[PDB]
């Protein structure tokens, strides 16, 4: 996608409000929850059993700070976001072997999950802007899929 | 299906949706035109400008059919009878704009009742919209 | 959802294909993993190449509970309960997956069939395989 | 997008024996048929009524024409989509109000005409030829939207 300059600065003003491992457990927790088959890639995760399993497993939290630790940091490189993810997109393909349609899952719970961590602040244009992000980098790493 | 405890969930977090249903629905619609622009192609006929009057008018008017169907959760064929009839014979939009309704009434709720959207509740109200996606997407063909 | 002109079109056209069920299905798959590359994903375990003897053993399993679905038109959700279950649990495959599939279930079937692919007939199976898939997913969550 | 070399070849020479007025007919017509709600936008094409009425229209066929005519210059441009069909996105949208899931569907159905004329010669490989290229004619004509 593209995103306007005043878009960009709009991602870029409220996820300086982020904090990234709290966030990225939450949206990863919410997809274990929300779309359960997402757990496929956790059978040695530990203990799934209910919502609040999930969102209490520390391995989830674990992996949640990487996956969006990562999301965080591509956030520099709007601008190249299939660049900037073409190797964690062979990764995922070539040895992780995940569906891209679980990006797309994440990005959109990730977007709620900003609604409801900063309500009102999150308003329809800041909204519309990072629907852009999510679905970029979702894009971005499926590109390298064969 | 949705379950009892799904049932319990919708209707508690959208019982708190009360009197702002109308609000709510009209903010969903505005954050879908934005977000998905492609939705705009069933409304060329609207004034889409924020504080629109026919978007609020809309709003109120899709809130009050999910209200009803939270009301006869049970029962949300027969409930929506009339409406999936409209969907499916004159309106006829393509069935994928129901996720991105759906999902923009998801963040709207998220928006608005920090308290009620945990990760279970969250789950079930998005089974629900799903639910009354299917409904509504029912009788296309 | 399936009407009965639908269910006499599906009987005419799988009976039509008859005991090339088997090898349309292994078919079927191969286009899917060529023309959906991400589909790819639920297979680590498999040789993928054409001709491949995995491939043609699982097409035939697909097709089998095609034949099975067929025969329980009326009665398809107990008939297809293992494989909700199998689906929704262990295989989990993302329901995205179940359109690509369908779609090229229907395009084999579109390559094999001259006289029976006839509009009508072609979107009863259409809508055959969209309710196969809804049931096999409906467990999921 | 992004066909391979063979990919290419393989499209090109499938083409070759199209008969494109045949096909964007059955195709366009097909659409209305599996997908009844797209006749949203064929209010005044007179009878739609019944398959045979749909797949009979004399309008159905003329617009056939056009529209796979259309798609047919664009084979012509493989590597730049986006500018082929920009102006004929701009029509959809503005003018048309055509919904851009309907360019996958038709994408989707005229791959289905395809096989269903062709037979064994509409082969796993050039299927996938074909679905990169209705997927990036669908993405092209979607692209100017707003
Ligand atoms: C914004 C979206 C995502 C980003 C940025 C991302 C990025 C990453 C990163 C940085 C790693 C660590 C790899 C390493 O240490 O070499 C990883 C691993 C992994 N990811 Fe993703 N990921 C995303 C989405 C997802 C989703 C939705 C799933 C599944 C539902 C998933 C499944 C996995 C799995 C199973 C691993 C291996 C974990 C491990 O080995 O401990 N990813 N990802
Ligand atoms: C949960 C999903 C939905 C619900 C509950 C819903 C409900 C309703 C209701 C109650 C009406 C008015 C009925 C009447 O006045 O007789 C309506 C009309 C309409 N809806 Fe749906 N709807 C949904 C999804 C959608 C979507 C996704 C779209 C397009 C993206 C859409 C497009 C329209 C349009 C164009 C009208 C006519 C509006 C007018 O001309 O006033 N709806 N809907
Ligand atoms: C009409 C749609 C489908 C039908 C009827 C179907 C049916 C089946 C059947 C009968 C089996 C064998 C189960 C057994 O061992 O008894 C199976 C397994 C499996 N299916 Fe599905 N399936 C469908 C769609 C899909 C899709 C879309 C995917 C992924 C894109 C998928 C992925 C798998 C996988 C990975 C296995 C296990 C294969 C193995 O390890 O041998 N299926 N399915
Ligand atoms: C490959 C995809 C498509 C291409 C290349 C295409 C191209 C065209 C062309 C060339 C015309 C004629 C313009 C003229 O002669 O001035 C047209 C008109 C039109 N198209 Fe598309 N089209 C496509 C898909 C669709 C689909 C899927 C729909 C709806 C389901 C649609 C709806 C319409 C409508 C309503 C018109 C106006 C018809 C009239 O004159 O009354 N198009 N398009």
Same mark, same amino acid.
């Given at each position: 996608?593209? *995103? ?22 939450? /949206?990863? #927790? ?21 919502? &609040?399993?999930?969102? #209490?497993?520390?391995?989830?939290? /674990? ?6 630790? /990562?999301?965080? &940091? #591509? ?15 062979? *990764?995922?393909? &070539?040895? *992780? ?8 899952? *994440? #990005? ?6 900003? =609604? ?18 999510? =679905? ?11 | 299906? !949705? %379950? ?41 006929? $609207?004034?889409? %400008? ?11 008017? +899709?809130?009050?059919? @999910? ?5 006869? +959760? ?5 409930? @929506?009878?009339?409406?999936?009839? !409209?969907?499916?014979?004159? !309106? ?5 704009? $129901? ?5 923009? !009434? @998801? ?9 009620? $959207? ?9 089974? $629900? @919209?799903? %639910? +009354?996606?299917? +409904?509504?997407? %029912?009788?296309?063909?």
């Amino acid at each position: 996608v593209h *995103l306007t300059p005043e878009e960009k600065s709009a991602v870029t003003a409220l996820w300086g409000k982020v904090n990234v491992d709290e966030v990225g457990g939450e /949206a990863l #927790g919410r997809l274990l929850v929300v779309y359960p088959w997402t757990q496929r890639f956790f059978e040695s995760f530990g203990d799934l059993s209910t919502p &609040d399993a999930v969102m #209490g497993n520390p391995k989830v939290k /674990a992996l949640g700070k990487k996956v969006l630790g /990562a999301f965080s &940091d #591509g956030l520099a490189h709007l601008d190249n976001l299939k660049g900037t993810f073409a190797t964690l997109s062979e *990764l995922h393909c &070539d040895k *992780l072997h995940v569906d891209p349609e679980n990006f797309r899952l *994440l #990005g959109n719970v990730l977007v709620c999950v900003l =609604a409801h961590h900063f309500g009102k602040e999150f308003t329809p244009p800041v909204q519309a802007a990072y629907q852009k992000v999510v =679905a970029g980098v979702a894009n971005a790493l499926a590109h390298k899929y064969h | 299906v !949705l %379950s009892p405890a799904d049932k319990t969930n919708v209707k508690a977090a959208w019982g708190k949706v009360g009197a702002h249903a109308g609000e709510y629905g009209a903010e969903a619609l505005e954050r879908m035109f934005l977000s998905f622009p492609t939705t705009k192609t069933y409304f060329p006929h $609207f004034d889409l %400008s924020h504080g629109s009057a026919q978007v609020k008018g809309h709003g109120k008017k +899709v809130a009050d059919a @999910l209200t009803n169907a939270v009301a006869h +959760v049970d029962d949300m064929p027969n409930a @929506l009878s009339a409406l999936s009839d !409209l969907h499916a014979h004159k !309106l006829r939009v393509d069935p994928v704009n $129901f996720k991105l309704l759906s999902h923009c !009434l @998801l963040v709207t709720l998220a928006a608005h009742l920090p308290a009620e $959207f945990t990760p279970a509740v969250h789950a079930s109200l998005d089974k $629900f @919209l799903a %639910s +009354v996606s299917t +409904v509504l997407t %029912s009788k296309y063909r």
